[model samples]
Target: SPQPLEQIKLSESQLSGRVGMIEMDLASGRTLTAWRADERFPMVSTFKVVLCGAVLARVDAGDEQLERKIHYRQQDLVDYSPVSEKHLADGMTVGELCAAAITMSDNSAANLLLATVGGPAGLTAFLRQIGDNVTRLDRWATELNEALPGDARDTTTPASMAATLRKLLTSQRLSARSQRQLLQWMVDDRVAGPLIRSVLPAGWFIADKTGAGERGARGIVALLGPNNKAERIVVIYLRDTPASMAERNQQIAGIGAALIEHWQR
Candidate 1:
């Protein structure tokens, strides 16, 4: 098989877009593959993972309760809030909101949790506290995915995102329970989870969050492994292309396919 970088470059050329990716060893924090890993791309729906991370950190600090129920008006709902819209009358617990936001990419659920963590700036503070000075949340969902050209608003580099995720899941920055909960939420993800899982070879497991935006921008941040153990962190981002959603999805899948095929190298 072609080397990892060659396969990634091939995918980028096929899609006529730039691709940024990083594959990191979960145990040692070594980057196995990197291409444009420092370039910025919109966070899109993937920001929900970090948003929920902030909430979990609050719970760890005894400042917030996951079981607490939060109610919102119909006017507060945003686009693509399938789960939150269903619970408008009775409301949902903070834990449930995180599940919807991460697993389903529910926009209203995300905004409500965003408010709980003090919106974009608050979450950015949380990231900084955790030593993630690179990833930033500048806007709420839907708008964050605008992915306009020449705009750095709501963007992150693949290298920074991988490092932040590593700290959250492995560095003991969050309580053990919080870390496990975050991993579980990603494992239950319904957005890009199935697609990535489908393309993987047998015996491999994946947990991930996906994002999409205008100009063919899309991404998936994930933990993948064999035998149900998270062995690596993979972050892939695409932008500035005019490809169809199908083409974008396939491009990312092709990248995953290459990683799996060359995992031992």
Candidate 2:
């Protein structure tokens, strides 16, 4: 019996209420499916994906050296931030800082790297070069001082972010080696939230970044298929909701798992 194409039931058993977007590319350049691709949402730490590219671009341009030392001060820390002042306030190399910034979603480390790689202005400049006008990093965590009422930090749309990742995978603008290195770092990320890492099968090589902000969460998951024969990228984001961290992660995992299952079929 032939399976009906549109009738294929993709269950949302684990997925709770979500306002989400997903984009998948099997051949690197073509988009398979998109839902709410143009919708804008607070990006949380997922913004680091672009920062990774920016940092590598600076390295490529010789404007910044990966081995340069960065010393952190107590004032550099953000209140209730994940990055420890003890871990960051000491002198560390740029490579080490970048690792912490991405892997741990270290707010202080991110700001430190942002400043070293050129600050918000530099980040904006790079985004323009990449043709990403909707993605912006306006302020660092600590720079926000304290979250005042109605004071939002920054944001990006799924379309722009997916495009950024697409460019990185295809080496459209970044050098092949640099793209590989950035992807490798993302794969080594230590922070595993429920959004992406939870849905993957065991032993699968998964490279991803997770982001969380007030009332929202977002993530990008990349799976390197066996022997690098094929690869899949899935982006999920939820916003303006009342879901707890656990519930939100379940939604992210559910969406990711559903996409993977659909692709395999």
Candidate 3:
């Protein structure tokens, strides 16, 4: 009694505003999608994805020294969800900062990276060099929180994010070393949700990111299989869903589990 895999729970949700979902099979290039895959949503902390890419891109560009130490000034300090809050009190080396930034979605670490590159504009400049034109990281998380209730300081469509992450996983946008480290962070303990992790089949894993805010976003550009048989990439994204953070987590887990079951078969 294996019913077809479809978007029952997702489409039926009363979550207002916008919602986006997309899943792709990388090797075959087949895509599974819900409505609004092309629409942009407030990217929230997901902008960390861009920040990490920008920092590493700078290293490949000969503009960053990963081992060098960076001390934080008062302006660099911000609160919440930052591993930097607990671990980067004194300062951070560039490598350390990037690790925490991506692995923990550390806001302060992202701010430091933002400044190291220049600012939101600087990050965007690097992204443009790499052909990513959709994400706009215009404000820091601190700045976004300051405005609250209406801050769209950063944004990306589900389709765009999926494409970006897929490129990161399958393309040479970053140096080989950087690509490995970046994917490692995606699977870091701090990044993967219970539901996201729960869905993985044996011998397969996910390289993923999570975004949470008023609407919420989650994405995975995953690779699957244990053989030489041409395996496929699996990418999923959700944004602007109307649910509490706790509820959102559960819903996402449900979706992830379903997709894994569906894809593996």
Candidate achieving the largest TM-score:
1
Query: What are the TM-scores, per candidate, against the unseen true structure?
Result: 0.97, 0.82, 0.80
Descending-lDDT candidate ranking: 1, 2, 3
Candidate 1 — which pairs collide?
Answer: none
Error of 1 at 95 (Å): 0.3
Task: List the candidate 2 regions with Cα displacement exceeding 4 Å.
Answer: 1-18, 80-84, 87-90, 142-153, 193-199, 221-230
Candidate 3: misplaced stretches above 4 Å? Answer: 1-5, 8-14, 26-34, 86-90, 145-152, 191-195, 198-201, 215-242
Error of 1 at 94 (Å): 0.3
The lDDT per prediction is 0.90, 0.64, 0.62
**TM-score of candidate 2 on Cα atoms, chains taken together:** 0.82
Worst lDDT 10-window in candidate 1: 192-201
- Tens digits of per-residue lDDT for model 3, 224-253: 444422255444445555556666656555
**Model 1, 25-64: lDDT tens per residue?**
9888998898999999887788889999999999999999
True-vs-predicted CA distance for residue 27, candidate 3, Å: 5.7
